[PDB]
A paper describes a structure:
BG24, a VRC01-class broadly neutralizing antibody (bNAb) against HIV-1 Env with relatively few somatic hypermutations (SHMs), represents a promising target for vaccine strategies to elicit CD4-binding site (CD4bs) bNAbs. The glycan at position N276gp120 is highly conserved and poses the greatest steric barrier to binding VRC01-class bNAb iGLs, as Ab residues in the iGL CDRL1 that interact with this region are typically 11–12 residues and cannot accommodate the N276gp120 glycan. Mature CD4bs Abs develop shortened or flexible CDRL1s to accommodate this glycan.
Two iGL versions of BG24 Fab constructs were made starting with the VH1-2*02 and VL2-11*01 heavy and light chain germline gene segment sequences: one containing the CDR3s from mature BG24 (BG24iGL-CDR3mat) and the other containing the iGL CDR3s (BG24iGL-CDR3iGL). We also solved a 1.4 Å crystal structure of unbound BG24iGL-CDR3mat Fab, which exhibited six disordered residues within CDRL1, but otherwise superimposed with a 1.3 Å root mean square deviation (rmsd; calculated for 225 VH-VL Cα atoms) with the Env-bound BG24iGL-CDR3mat Fab structure, suggesting no major structural differences upon Env binding.
Author numbering:
A (entry chain L): 2 to 9, 11 to 26, 31 to 91, 96 to 211
B (entry chain H): 1 to 52, 52A, 53 to 82, 82A, 82B, 82C, 83 to 100, 100A, ...
The structure:
């Protein structure tokens, strides 16, 4: 009912990768390329629909189903969703690595004087040069998590085929001035880069 | 060829309704259920419900109860999904899908999918941006390099483009894709990395173009005090 899969998996061409799906015998797997409908790759744990390459296989441990792709090819880079009856996992971006992994560059800007004078406040967290193209962004006010007022974009490709994203935190000027600092925390491939800004008159 | 063909993309205002069609061919439409699945932009798949084209019976996910009506016209092998009282967060690709050729008893998963129908729900009207400077500081500095930028706030519709110094400044420029706010307006930012020694000597102006509102803004970005 609440199927969980990793946000990001990656491997190099020719390698094998595995995507897990954890729940609470009918787990299936879809592949989705940009602008296209999902394509069924594996159903009922291990069955392959006609025409799906033999490199795609499925298995099931206890309560974790697994899609394995052997001999990774560039065309396998796509989103993958597990499913069980009407329920879907949240999706895994599979990257077929074509350059070294790269951590995000993060720049955080505080509200401008002009915006504060207009009675608004926006923190701007700009995230660039990361690969694979999957990040999560969290914000903190002082040391406590902030979720209200946050908007984050999906990653997009830059000229060098790395990825960029941005996240915006909307606050009142009073909220901005009442904390010692705010922080934007970007998680990429399990590690985090966090930038902090503070009110400065 | 077993296939499902959907109607084209739609644009609606909140509170309205949308009706998407899905025409089956290459298999007997009445032999199989028809399901609908949607996917909000950048998000995952969510099942909405099914219709039995023989009985007309339906079953809907709890999220869509009271707002979704699935129907079919067997004479033209077509299923319909009508979603009413539309919300901005109903903006999504809507797929019809079903199970036709598989060796399974469950009716899930789905081997046959329509191409999807994008439905955009928005209450926003044309509005030019407010442009704020993102001033450089010793915080936005690293390799003797300073980052400065422009925040282009609260515009509609897309797109906005940004250049720096009327196009004379291209190295180190990065204009980011826009975020869509809950207000229905977009914001984006553009940043440029420059030599920190050049601050105070070189003028930096971001040139924002929002053709949908016939607006251009040239915003000077200078260091803080």
């Amino acid at each position: 009912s609440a199927l969980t899969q990793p946000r990001s998996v990656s491997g190099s061409p020719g390698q094998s990768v595995t995507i897990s799906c954890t729940g609470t015998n009918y787990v299936s797997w879809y592949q989705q390329h940009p602008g296209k409908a999902p394509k069924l790759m594996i159903y009922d744990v291990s069955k392959r629909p006609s025409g799906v390459p033999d490199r795609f296989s499925g298995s099931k441990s206890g309560n974790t189903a697994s899609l394995t792709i052997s001999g990774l090819q560039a065309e396998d880079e796509a989103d993958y969703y597990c499913s069980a009856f009407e329920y879907f996992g949240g999706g895994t971006k599979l990257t077929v690595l074509s350059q070294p992994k790269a951590a995000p560059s993060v720049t955080l800007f505080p509200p401008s004087s002009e915006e504060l004078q207009a009675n608004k406040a926006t923190l701007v967290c700009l995230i660039s040069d990361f690969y694979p193209g999957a990040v999560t962004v969290a914000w903190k006010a002082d040391s406590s998590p902030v979720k209200a007022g946050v908007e984050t974009t999906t990653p997009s490709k830059q000229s060098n085929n790395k990825y960029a994203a941005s996240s915006y935190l909307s606050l009142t000027p009073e909220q901005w001035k009442s904390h010692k600092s705010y922080s934007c925390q970007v998680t990429h491939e399990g590690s985090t880069v966090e930038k902090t800004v503070a009110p400065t008159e | 060829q077993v296939q499902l063909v959907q109607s084209g993309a739609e644009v609606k205002k909140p509170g309205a309704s949308v009706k998407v069609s899905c025409k089956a061919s290459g298999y007997t439409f009445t032999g199989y259920y028809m399901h609908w699945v949607r996917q909000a932009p950048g998000q995952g798949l969510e099942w909405m419900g099914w219709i039995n084209p023989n009985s007309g019976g339906t079953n809907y996910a709890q999220k869509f109860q009271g707002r979704v009506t699935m129907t079919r016209d067997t004479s033209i092998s077509t299923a319909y999904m009508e979603l009413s009282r539309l919300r901005s967060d109903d903006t999504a690709v809507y797929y019809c899908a079903t199970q036709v050729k598989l060796d399974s008893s469950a009716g899930y998963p789905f081997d046959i999918w329509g191409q999807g129908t994008m439905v955009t729900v928005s209450s926003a009207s044309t509005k030019g941006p407010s442009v704020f400077p993102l001033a450089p500081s010793s915080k936005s500095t690293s390799g003797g390099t300073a980052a400065l930028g422009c925040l282009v706030k609260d515009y509609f519709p897309e797109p906005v483009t940004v250049s720096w110094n009327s196009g004379a400044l291209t190295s180190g420029v990065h204009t980011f894709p826009a975020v869509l706010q809950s207000s229905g307006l977009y914001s984006l930012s553009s940043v440029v990395t420059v030599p920190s020694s050049s601050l105070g000597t070189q003028t930096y102006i971001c040139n924002v173009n929002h053709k949908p509102s016939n607006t251009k803004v040239d915003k000077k970005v200078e260091p803080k005090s």
